[PDB]
Amino acid sequence: RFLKVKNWETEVVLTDTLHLKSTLETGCTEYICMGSIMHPSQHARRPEDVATKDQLFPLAKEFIDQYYSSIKRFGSKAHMERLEEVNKEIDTTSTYQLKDTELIYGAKHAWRNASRCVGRIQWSKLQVFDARDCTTAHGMFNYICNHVKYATNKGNLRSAITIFPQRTDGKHDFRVWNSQLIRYAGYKQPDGSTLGDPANVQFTEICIQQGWKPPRGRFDVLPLLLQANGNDPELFQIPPELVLEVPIRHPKFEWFKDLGLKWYGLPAVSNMLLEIGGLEFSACPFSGWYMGTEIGVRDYCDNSRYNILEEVAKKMNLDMRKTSSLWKDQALVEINIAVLYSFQSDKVTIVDHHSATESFIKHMENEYRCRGGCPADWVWIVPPMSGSITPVFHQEMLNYRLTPSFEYQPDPWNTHVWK
Amino acid sequence: RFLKVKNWETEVVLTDTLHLKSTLETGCTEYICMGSIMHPVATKDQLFPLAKEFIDQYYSSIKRFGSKAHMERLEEVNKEIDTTSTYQLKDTELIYGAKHAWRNASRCVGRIQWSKLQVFDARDCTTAHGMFNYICNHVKYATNKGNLRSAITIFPQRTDGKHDFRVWNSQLIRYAGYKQPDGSTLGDPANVQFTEICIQQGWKPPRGRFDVLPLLLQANGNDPELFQIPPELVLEVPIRHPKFEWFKDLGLKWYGLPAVSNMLLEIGGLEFSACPFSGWYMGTEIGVRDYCDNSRYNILEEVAKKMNLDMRKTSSLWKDQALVEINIAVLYSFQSDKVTIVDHHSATESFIKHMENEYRCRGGCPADWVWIVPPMSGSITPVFHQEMLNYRLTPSFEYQPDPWNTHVWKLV
Ligand code: HEM
Ligand code: HEM
Ligand SMILES: Cc1cc(N)nc(COc2cc(CCN3CCC(F)(F)CC3)cc(F)c2F)c1
Ligand SMILES: Cc1cc(N)nc(COc2cc(CCN3CCC(F)(F)CC3)cc(F)c2F)c1
Ligand SMILES: C[C@H](O)[C@H](O)[C@H]1CNc2nc(N)[nH]c(=O)c2N1
Ligand SMILES: C[C@H](O)[C@H](O)[C@H]1CNc2nc(N)[nH]c(=O)c2N1
Ligand SMILES: [Zn+2]
Numbered sequence: 001r002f003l004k005v006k007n008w009e010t011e012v013v014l015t016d017t018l019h020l021k022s023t024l025e026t027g028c029t030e031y032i033c034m035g036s037i038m039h040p041s042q043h044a045r046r047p048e049d050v051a052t053k054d055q056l057f058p059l060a061k062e063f064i065d066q067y068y069s070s071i072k073r074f075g076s077k078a079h080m081e082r083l084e085e086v087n088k089e090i091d092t093t094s095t096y097q098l099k100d101t102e103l104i105y106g107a108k109h110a111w112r113n114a115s116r117c118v119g120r121i122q123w124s125k126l127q128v129f130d131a132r133d134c135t136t137a138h139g140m141f142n143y144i145c146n147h148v149k150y151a152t153n154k155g156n157l158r159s160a161i162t163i164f165p166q167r168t169d170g171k172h173d174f175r176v177w178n179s180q181l182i183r184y185a186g187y188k189q190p191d192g193s194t195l196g197d198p199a200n201v202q203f204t205e206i207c208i209q210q211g212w213k214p215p216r217g218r219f220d221v222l223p224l225l226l227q228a229n230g231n232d233p234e235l236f237q238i239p240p241e242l243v244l245e246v247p248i249r250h251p252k253f254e255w256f257k258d259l260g261l262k263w264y265g266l267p268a269v270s271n272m273l274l275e276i277g278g279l280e281f282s283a284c285p286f287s288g289w290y291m292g293t294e295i296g297v298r299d300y301c302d303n304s305r306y307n308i309l310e311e312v313a314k315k316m317n318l319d320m321r322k323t324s325s326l327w328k329d330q331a332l333v334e335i336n337i338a339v340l341y342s343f344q345s346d347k348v349t350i351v352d353h354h355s356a357t358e359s360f361i362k363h364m365e366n367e368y369r370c371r372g373g374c375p376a377d378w379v380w381i382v383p384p385m386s387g388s389i390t391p392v393f394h395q396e397m398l399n400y401r402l403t404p405s406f407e408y409q410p411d412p413w414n415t416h417v418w419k
Numbered sequence: 420r421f422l423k424v425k426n427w428e429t430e431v432v433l434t435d436t437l438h439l440k441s442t443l444e445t446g447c448t449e450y451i452c453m454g455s456i457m458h459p460v461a462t463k464d465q466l467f468p469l470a471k472e473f474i475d476q477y478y479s480s481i482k483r484f485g486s487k488a489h490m491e492r493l494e495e496v497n498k499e500i501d502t503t504s505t506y507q508l509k510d511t512e513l514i515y516g517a518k519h520a521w522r523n524a525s526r527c528v529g530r531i532q533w534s535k536l537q538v539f540d541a542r543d544c545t546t547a548h549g550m551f552n553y554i555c556n557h558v559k560y561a562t563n564k565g566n567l568r569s570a571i572t573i574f575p576q577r578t579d580g581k582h583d584f585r586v587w588n589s590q591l592i593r594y595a596g597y598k599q600p601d602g603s604t605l606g607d608p609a610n611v612q613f614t615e616i617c618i619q620q621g622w623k624p625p626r627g628r629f630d631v632l633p634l635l636l637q638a639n640g641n642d643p644e645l646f647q648i649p650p651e652l653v654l655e656v657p658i659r660h661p662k663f664e665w666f667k668d669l670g671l672k673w674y675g676l677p678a679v680s681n682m683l684l685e686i687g688g689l690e691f692s693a694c695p696f697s698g699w700y701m702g703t704e705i706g707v708r709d710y711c712d713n714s715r716y717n718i719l720e721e722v723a724k725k726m727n728l729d730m731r732k733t734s735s736l737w738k739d740q741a742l743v744e745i746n747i748a749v750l751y752s753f754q755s756d757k758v759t760i761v762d763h764h765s766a767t768e769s770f771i772k773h774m775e776n777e778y779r780c781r782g783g784c785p786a787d788w789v790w791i792v793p794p795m796s797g798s799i800t801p802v803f804h805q806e807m808l809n810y811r812l813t814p815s816f817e818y819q820p821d822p823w824n825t826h827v828w829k830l831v
Binding site: 003005006008009019022024025026027028029030031032033034035036037038142292297298301302303304309323324325326328329330332333336337340341344352354355378379382383384386387388389393395396397398399400401 | 422425426427429438441442444445446447448449450451452453454455456457651702703707708711712713719733734735738739740742743744746747750751754762764765788789792793794795796797798799803805806807808809810811
């Protein structure tokens with residue numbers, strides 16, 4: 001009927017009715033909760049390939065309805081024309097095309113709806129680049145460069161999304177094969193260890209296989225591997241002057257700069273699927289700006305990532321015999337101090353996890369005020385260090401799936417037939 | 420039906436069949452997940468299937484299912500429910516029930532020790548003085564001069580609801596909280612309400628920072644009664660730091676024995692409304708939650724102050740820096756006094772080992788990621804990366820209303 005969530009630090013109780021508009025399954029049941037499953041559900045809104053009219057149109061009707069409801073219409077002339085227009089369009093092309101307004105609406109609301117995104121207070125300030133006229137990988141390279149350059153903005157990062165042509169039959173997808181626009185290569189060393197970023201060893205090998213010439217450093221920005229209209233993907237090197245990087249140094253430890261660490265400034269997720277009114281935009285790279293922990297905790301300290309903890313602990317002269325000295329926890333703090341200090345010293349947008357989580361609490365409040373709820377994944381929202389000293393740790397959250405949304409999709413090299 | 424859980428750090432995949440045996444709700448629906456919600460007497464007819472379920476499972480665990488003894492027990496339980504509208508667990512069933520309620524505690528990271536549980540049967544207890552005696556012996560046994568040992572003491576089960584046994588304390592050892600006229604709090608701000616209840620019941624408070632609270636014990640539905648745990652049974656650890664000589668000057672201490680006492684133990688449909696159980700601490704419970712939660716002792720600013728940290732902006736991570744040192748202090752202090760403690764790294768690693776074993780021998784292990792992940796350094800512990808299925812098996816430990824919200828006072 002209606003569900004309350006409580007913050008146990010402040011005893012604020014919020015009352016959620018927005019979940020009544022939830023469309024697809026969470027993966028949980030009355031008897032089993034999957035809230036820590038990374039991909040709990042395969043409930044998609046349309047079949048795998050080109051859907052029949054009774055399949056795609058209801059999804060379309062729902063989104064147009066929602067969009068016109070959003071803008072204080074519904075039933076207006078333009079709404080009833082838009083329905084008949086989408087009707088005839090599906091009647092004659094098995095798909096339909098979004099107007100520019102609806103596309104901008106759907107992107108912003110997919111972001112707004114992203115229960116895993118702590119950054120959503122910014123949701124309505126999204127720059128939407130319409131790339132639906134794109135037709136070749138070279139055109140995708142042009143569009144993505146413009147995205148990177150606009151979003152980077154000489155460090156004053158700007159949120160943006162570039163939306164390439166929607167899926168038609170499934171054999172013609174546009175995909176950015178890179179999981180993110182800018183990542184560092186991972187190199188399988190002969191002994192068995194790994195140089196660079198271990199997460200990317202496979203993708204780095206597809207790139208080498210596709211003819212990329214690895215510099216074989218620790219921070220080799222990977223080429224783009226762009227696929228247009230289902231064709232074989234093509235490699236492009238992003239102009240280095242477009243890839244802003246921050247050398248990581250520490251405000252107290254002078255020896256820290258000598259770890260040779262740097263990171264890139266723009267986080268740009270490029271492997272997710274944007275779904276609006278039943279249409280599926282398989283190539284929609286979206287970017288914002290980093291939360292320090294993503295680099296300082298996950299990218300740097302995960303065991304199967306850069307794994308610098310013991311290296312930094314050594315330089316710190318920390319008791320590393322046993323776990324209880326908390327040498328890992330201590331170094332982990334210093335690394336995230338360095339990351340934050342470095343980005344701010346170079347005037348590159350970055351938000352610490354205290355500020356970010358605080359903003360999200362404010363966002364939840366706004367959303368419950370105006371929308372009647374805010375889907376949020378507590379497992380993703382709580383930062384990967386110092387969880388309980390951030391306000392979201394003490395904040396109950398309801399999770400549910402609202403459309404438009406960003407969705408996971410298979411890695412294209414698992415599903416692509418080469419030519 | 421099967422369900423797979425992945426570890427994204429190791430790629431190990433486990434297959435959960437055990438979830439097919441849960442029965443009460445998780446709180447989640449098919450379209451909403453409530454996995455971060457903290458909190459989401461039986462008739463004769465209701466009790467028979469619950470009883471049979473538990474007796475069936477006990478006899479299954481001991482490879483005696485279908486046996487002569489299984490079937491007579493089942494019939495013997497049915498007669499009791501017919502006669503008395505309830506039944507009595509055998510001692511073996513009580514021990515097994517209690518161990519398995521711990522085993523099934525999806526929020527508990529220390530379940531690798533679930534089968535080493537000392538079970539104190541206190542179902543013959545009739546008065547608050549009796550409960551105190553039992554609880555004193557529990558505390559002495561568990562504390563074991565710092566070599567802490569897991570233990571539960573089980574008092575008589577619910578009958579009509581009018582005769583509940585209750586430990587009104589949320590935990591057996593807690594420090595008192597006193598709000599001052601000026602709004603400030605002395606002691607443990609969490610326990611201010613419960614301290615007020617004791618003071619009203621007659622407890623004379625020392626009004627200090629680490630006053631061990633008195634037990635407030637209710638037997639057979641009667642008004643609860645006050646008892647002072649004998650001070651020699653409350654092992655405490657003064658918190659010092661290995662590096663900062665100044666840390667001892669914070670005057671911090673903590674009690675060695677964590678002993679939860681406000682929960683309900685549910686075995687075969689029977690409700691044991693008073694079942695205090697204890698183990699030993701994970702360091703972050705004290706060092707992160709007890710000390711650094713804002714609603715708690717809130718010593719981050721104090722500790723950061725003494726670290727000459729820049730506390731102007733959050734991005735200096737002064738809170739994270741001070742939190743780590745505090746948790747080092749907690750572990751170093753307990754270890755130096757040879758009082759059992761476990762750091763969150765060692766604890767999470769053992770629980771993964773345990774979880775894996777539980778999938779192998781039992782077909783799964785229900786687990787609450789929101790509670791298993793430590794409250795600091797979350798992703799540098801192995802559990803953060805471990806997918807976990809959450810579901811509710813019985814026997815279970817269950818939450819229950821605070822007794823002062825339900826008790827109807829006898830004394831005029
Ligand atoms: C503007 C600054 C932003 C910040 C600080 C931010 C923060 C974050 C963080 C920390 C995560 C978790 C990332 C991880 O642990 O891998 C996340 C997830 C996510 N964000 Fe945001 N975000 C921002 C902008 C955006 C934008 C512009 C979009 C889309 C238009 C977006 C959509 C998402 C989605 C879909 C996820 C889930 C990703 C997944 O499931 O793998 N975010 N965000
Ligand atoms: C032996 C060492 C033990 C360790 C290291 C341990 C560790 C923990 C921790 C860290 C929590 C989370 C507590 C919180 O954040 O408030 C917890 C919860 C819990 N533990 Fe264990 N525990 C231990 C023993 C036990 C025993 C002996 C029992 C029962 C016989 C038990 C049953 C539970 C239950 C039911 C919870 C959930 C608490 C709640 O829901 O409020 N644990 N444990
Ligand atoms: C828009 C946006 C803003 C922001 N501030 N952050 C993000 C998240 O962006 C990245 C995320 C990752 C890691 C993704 N992670 C890998 C392991 C996993 F698969 F298990 C879960 C997903 C690497 C990157 F380079 C990223 F830019 C996105
Ligand atoms: C057997 C066992 C071992 C262990 N290692 N730990 C525990 C849990 O022990 C305690 C937990 C708490 C606080 C519980 N917490 C209160 C705030 C909340 F209500 F929000 C959520 C529950 C206080 C204490 F004194 C504790 F001993 C139990
Ligand atoms: C809102 C949220 O569920 C709440 O803060 C939970 C989070 N995880 C927790 N985890 C543990 N171990 N103990 C807790 O009290 C909590 N509190
Ligand atoms: C198993 C677990 O769900 C997985 O490791 C999750 C935990 N929470 C996370 N939270 C964020 N923000 N990002 C992640 O990659 C993860 N990983
Ligand atoms: Zn759930």
